[PDB]
């Protein structure tokens, strides 16, 4: 014979988005998402060329553009570290 069973547990979902936000002059970091402060200055990457904080700029790497390793962002450091550059230029 056949013995079926109906009855599923579902939940309503409808999250609303409403929060004053604006990033024109790099109000906050583009990674950690933290409020910039006097002590926490900003750092303009040399590769990606973006705005980041000290926490997101505590790494250096020797790029093919510059002779010596400059201060880069974790987004570039880790990336370049987990990438494959076989004479790409
Ligand atoms: Zn940051
Ligand atoms: Zn970068």
From Swiss-Prot:
Zn finger region (FYVE-type): 23-81
Function: Activating adapter involved in cargo sorting from early/recycling endosomes. Regulates retrieval of proteins from endosomes to the trans-Golgi network through interaction with the dynein-dynactin complex. Dual effector of RAB4B and RAB14, mediates a cooperative interaction allowing endosomal tethering and fusion. Binds phospholipid vesicles containing phosphatidylinositol 3-phosphate and participates in early endosomal trafficking.
Residues of the whole record sequence present: 627 to 708 of 708
Domain notes: The FYVE-type zinc finger domain mediates interactions with phosphatidylinositol 3-phosphate in membranes of early endosomes and penetrates bilayers. The FYVE domain insertion into PtdIns(3)P-enriched membranes is substantially increased in acidic conditions. The 2 coiled coil domains mediate the interaction with the dynein-dynactin complex, the RUN domain is also involved in the interaction. The coiled coil domains also mediate self-association.
Protein name stated in the entry: RUN and FYVE domain-containing protein 1
Protein's gene: RUFY1
Organism: Homo sapiens
Quaternary organization: Self-assembles through coiled coil domains to drive ELVA (endo-lysosomal vesicular assembly) formation. Interacts with BMX. May interact with SSB. Interacts with RAB4 and RAB5 that have been activated by GTP-binding. Interacts WITH RAB14 and RAB4B (GTP-bound form); the interactions allow endosomal tethering and fusion. Interacts with ARL8B (GTP-bound form); the interaction is required for RUFY1 endosomal location and promotes interaction with RAB14.
Annotated tissue distribution: Broadly expressed, with highest levels in lung, testis, kidney and brain.
Subcellular location: Early endosome membrane
Positions bound to Zn(2+) 2: 45, 48, 73, 76
Binding-site residues for Zn(2+) 1, renumbered to this chain: 29, 32, 53, 56
């Amino acid at each position: 014979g056949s013995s079926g069973s109906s009855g599923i547990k579902e939940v309503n979902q409808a999250l609303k988005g409403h929060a004053w936000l604006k990033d024109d002059e790099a109000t906050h970091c583009r990674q950690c998402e933290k409020e910039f402060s006097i002590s926490r200055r900003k750092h303009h990457c040399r590769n990606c060329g973006h705005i980041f904080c000290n926490t997101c700029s505590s790494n250096e790497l020797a790029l093919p553009s510059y002779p010596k390793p400059v201060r880069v962002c974790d987004s570039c450091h880790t990336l370049l570290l987990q990438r494959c550059s076989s004479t790409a230029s």
